[PDB]
């Protein structure tokens, strides 16, 4: 009931809608009909506004077939568009009917009947006649009531045979604020006080008149329903949970929706917060007029879009922060006017008007939008039974002309032929509708099965500093291990902590031996060690301070002092150990040297090459007797394209993968070069004019190094990149990939916005495999993070959904993967929530989680 | 739909008189025609379903004007300072389609016809 809604103040998994939802598109009239004069048209206050306050559109009126051919295409099961008034009635008085505009109307209905297309007509959008403006002072003289209920008879009488959705007035919050309040609609005055209060009165009574005339006379014998479209915007509290901002969130949805609402879906009055604060300017319902506007709608018709949010005086926001969450708008709906019916009758959003076919964001404000409505039905069970998606067509766009655009097919205003191309989103909203929802489509059905006897089942961790069960640490860790039957562990050493100086001259050999007990303790618990030697992070670069202080990896001598490094760890460890990561991703520390494109270059030059003095070392003096095996970590996210209708997107999708895994993969895997595709990119963009970056060839010799020095590919795999092409300025390494990011707010994702994308590890490793053979795969690092400290239901479930797509890449695509090592065995407290165990080392229900399926060697029939 | 007429009669000019057309469902536009022996049936007034739209014949705006209760379905005609011109058969009318027309051919029924005199 009235008031109801401040209550809103104070694992989501579903893709698809219920069964029989209703999927349709809208237009209004004088947005996209043009021919204003045509065939007897009456001008409307809109015509006047225009060739007054500013300076052919979609020609809907002539390209009937054209748009026909667009709603098929869509799929759209309903159609709403708005009868034009003055084009039935010049004079909006109901003499003598203008028949070439009857045609019109009735040829486009019989049209959508025959194509299956329920049509949902409104009445009144925004378009009065213009002689009722001038002789009568429009929705500000009463008379119009009773102008409007004529015109509502001629109109079910001429077309209610066919039509069983009608909308009495589009929005008529607007129609009283920006006609007669800012001034911004026609008729245009500005700051008229008494008009605003009285407009909205008198379409508040029209509307009614209107319901009950179809009440009385026409569902009877055409059986159909009547609302009227309501818009309104959404306000969140300035400050986080503020009693008296909460109030102010609640004033401001009264001021817009109530004012409308609760006379019609509500009470039968005003609301009574604006009775008080308007004590006289309001116009007063009598207790009887009061009993017929309450129930004068057989439904809630809502709007949502961009006209109840710009300009910012259309709604007092009343110091509380503007809102887009429909989600939440619902609610308030659904606990004001207690839980109704629910039609979508417009939603959207609006591009540039340089862009033509191409609307990549307005595809994930779709996906976003319609994900709100699915959780509003899902989770809070409101009876949301239909979607207008807004607009089919690019239009005129009321004040704002053709500055935006909104439509679902483009639109070429400078064309005579004025072709309607399917955008981005009418490919979207067409699969949208085959499916009933999210494209369940990248996502292939569970496998049952095992992996082979011998797969390692790693846990990981990062950098451990030094302090035999003498060591506090060590105990620590086995207490966690312990728990976990996981077979290898994977820890790094500190470069810095072992050799202080950089040098072979000062070891610190109560370092080396505090790691060997981390060895062997776990040796007895039958557990193998994968050592990785340098493991930089954000907190720590990890170089011992000489070498930092001398240029660090821009220095080529930090490539030596590192296989002096690795030699030792292999002389003092490699007995124990018979795996080794030397490097932890490097291909993302091009970000530490973020300042020249050809920086990052460099330094990741040196970081090869580091990679193959220790592995060669490795393998000339070390492998014979200890036959252990090395490699290196790479970053190696999945990458789609953001807006998959754009070549160029696709395009793009490949060339981060270049950019982020060949880099290092190329001339370490498979022919000691840097990667083609990244070469010959940085060739144009610096043979354009656009990056002073060279990617420098490599000697003969450089190339002899580095080719062929790993034992297997190991990957870290979190998350998949949606990618845009966008050719950006610059000379930094981010520049000469030409690449932007578009996150998809809309999938479950951890709290530091790490998206659960499973099926991206499955096509990473079909990459992998077509790029570099048959050579073996560890992901040596997965996780995501999760705020949850003992139900972490997030983290159990990337870690069934991803594992499962491991299993098909072994089963199904045959490749050859050999571990996986989860990320990550525990968290520190300032630092995000990846453990398996807390902080205070308490283990959370993951655990029993990843035992089972390394218990289980997969998911077995 | 079955349509009738009363309150004609004879009137002395410049007075007045007042008919009404009852009706025995659907809206429907009201008319009001008259016809004198010879002559053409010739459109009086009308008005819209709800009153909204009101037509009259030039010969008689200003004089006459047409109402109508939805309720008692009844159209009514109030004829003031009457001419002896406005001596004729009077004719209601009902049109179903709520478009206000001037001409007998648009009309689907009629009432069987009231007589008014203007003596001096």
């Known amino acids: 009931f009235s008031g109801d809604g401040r209550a809103i103040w104070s694992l989501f998994l579903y893709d698809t809608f219920p069964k029989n939802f209703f999927w349709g598109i809208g237009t209004g009239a004088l947005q996209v009909e043009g021919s204003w004069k045509k065939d007897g048209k009456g001008p409307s206050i809109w015509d006047h506004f225009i060739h007054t306050h500013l300076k052919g559109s979609s020609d809907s009126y002539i390209f009937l077939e054209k748009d026909l051919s667009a709603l098929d295409f869509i799929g759209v099961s309903f159609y709403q568009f708005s009868i034009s008034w003055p084009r039935l009635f010049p004079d909006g008085i109901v003499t003598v009917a203008n028949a070439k505009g009857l045609q019109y109307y009735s040829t486009l209905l019989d049209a959508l009947v025959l194509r299956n297309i329920e049509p949902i007509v409104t009445l009144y959008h925004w378009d009065l006649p213009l002689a009722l403006q001038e002789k009568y002072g429009g929705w500000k003289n009463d008379t119009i009531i009773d102008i409007f209920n004529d015109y509502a008879t001629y109109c079910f009488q001429m077309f209610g045979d066919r039509v069983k959705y009608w909308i009495t007035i589009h929005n008529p919050y607007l129609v009283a604020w920006h006609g007669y309040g800012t001034g911004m609609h026609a008729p245009g005055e500005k700051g008229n006080l008494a008009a605003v209060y009285t407009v909205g009165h008198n379409l508040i009574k029209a509307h009614s008149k209107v319901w009950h005339n179809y009440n009385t006379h026409f569902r009877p014998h055409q059986k159909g329903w009547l609302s009227i479209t309501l818009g309104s915007h959404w306000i969140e509290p300035q400050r986080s949970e503020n009693t008296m901002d909460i109030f102010k969130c609640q004033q401001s949805m009264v001021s817009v929706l109530g004012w409308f609402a609760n006379p019609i879906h509500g009470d039968g009055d005003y609301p009574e917060g604006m009775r008080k604060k308007l004590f006289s300017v309001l116009p007063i319902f009598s207790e009887a007029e009061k009993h017929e506007m309450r129930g004068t709608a057989d439904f809630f018709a809502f709007s949502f879009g961009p006209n109840n949010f710009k300009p910012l005086n259309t709604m007092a926001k009343m110091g509380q922060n503007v809102s887009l969450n429909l989600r939440e708008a619902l609610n308030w709906i659904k606990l004001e006017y207690n839980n109704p019916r629910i039609l979508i009758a417009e939603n959207g959003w609006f591009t540039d008007s340089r862009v033509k076919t191409e609307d990549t964001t307005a595809i994930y404000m779709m996906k976003n939008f319609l994900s709100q409505v699915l959780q509003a039905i899902r989770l809070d069970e409101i009876r949301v039974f239909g979607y207008t998606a807004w607009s089919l067509l690019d239009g005129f766009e009321w004040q704002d002309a053709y500055t935006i655009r909104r439509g679902l097919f483009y639109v070429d205003f400078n064309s005579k032929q004025k072709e309607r191309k399917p955008k981005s989103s009418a490919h979207y909203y067409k699969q949208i509708i085959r499916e009933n929802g999210f494209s369940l489509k990248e996502s292939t059905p569970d496998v049952q099965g095992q992996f082979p006897c011998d797969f390692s089942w790693g846990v990981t961790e990062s950098v451990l500093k030094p302090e035999c069960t003498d060591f506090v640490n060590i105990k620590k860790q086995l207490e966690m291990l312990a728990r976990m039957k996981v077979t290898h562990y994977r820890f790094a050493l500190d470069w810095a902590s072992v050799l202080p100086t950089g040098q072979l001259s000062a070891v610190n050999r109560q370092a080396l031996r505090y790691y060997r007990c981390v060895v062997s303790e776990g040796l007895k618990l039958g557990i193998s060690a994968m050592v990785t030697l340098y493991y930089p992070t954000h907190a720590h670069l990890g170089l011992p301070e000489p070498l930092l202080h001398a240029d660090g990896w821009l220095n080529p001598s930090t490539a030596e002092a590192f296989q002096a490094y690795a030699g030792l760890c292999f002389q003092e460890l490699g007995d124990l150990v018979k795996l080794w990561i030397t490097i932890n991703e490097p291909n993302r520390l091009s970000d530490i040297y973020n300042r020249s494109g050809n920086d990052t270059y460099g330094a990741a030059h040196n970081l090869l090459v580091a990679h193959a003095l220790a592995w060669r070392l490795y393998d000339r003096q070390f492998r014979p007797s200890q036959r252990g095996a090395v490699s290196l970590s790479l970053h190696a996210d999945w990458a789609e394209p953001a807006n998959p209708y754009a070549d160029s997107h696709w395009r793009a999708a490949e060339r981060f993968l270049q950019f982020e895994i060949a880099w290092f993969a190329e001339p370490l895997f498979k022919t000691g070069d840097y990667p083609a595709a990244m070469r010959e990119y940085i060739a144009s963009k610096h043979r354009r004019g656009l990056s002073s970056s060279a990617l420098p060839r490599l000697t003969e010799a450089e190339r002899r190094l580095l080719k062929g020095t790993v034992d297997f590919c190991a990957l870290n795999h979190f998350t998949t990149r949606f990618v845009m092409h966008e050719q950006l300025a610059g000379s930094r390494y981010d520049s000469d990939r030409d690449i932007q990011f578009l996150q998809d707010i809309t999938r479950l994702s951890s709290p530091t916005r790490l998206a659960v994308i499973p099926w991206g590890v499955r096509k990473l490793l079909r990459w992998v495999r077509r790029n570099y053979g048959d050579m073996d795969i560890y992901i040596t690092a997965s996780g995501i993070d999760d705020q949850a400290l003992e139900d972490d239901r997030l983290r159990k479930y990337y870690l069934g959904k991803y594992l499962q797509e491991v299993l098909k890449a072994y089963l199904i695509d045959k490749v050859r993967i050999k571990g996986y090592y989860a990320f990550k065995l525990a968290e520190e407290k300032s630092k995000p929530r990846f453990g398996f165990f807390t902080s205070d080392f308490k283990a959370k229900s993951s655990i029993q989680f990843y035992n089972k399926v390394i218990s289980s060697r997969g998911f077995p029939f | 739909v079955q349509l009738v007429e009363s309150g004609g009669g004879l009137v002395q000019a410049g007075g007045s008189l007042r008919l009404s057309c009852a009706a025995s469902?659907?809206?429907?536009?009201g008319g009001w025609f008259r016809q004198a022996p010879g002559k053409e049936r010739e459109f009086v007034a009308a008005?819209?379903?709800?009153?909204?739209?009101?037509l009259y014949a030039d010969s008689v705006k200003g004089r006459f004007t047409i109402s109508r209760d939805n309720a008692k379905n009844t159209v009514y005609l109030q004829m003031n300072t009457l001419k002896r011109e406005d001596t004729a058969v009077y004719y209601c009318?009902?049109?179903?389609?709520?478009?206000?027309?001037?001409?007998?051919?648009?009309?689907?029924?009629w009432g069987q016809g009231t007589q008014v005199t203007v003596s001096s």
């Open positions: 009318a009902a049109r179903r389609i709520n478009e206000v027309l001037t001409t007998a051919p648009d009309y689907d029924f």
């Open positions: 469902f659907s809206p429907y536009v």
């Open positions: 008005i819209s379903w709800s009153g909204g739209t009101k």
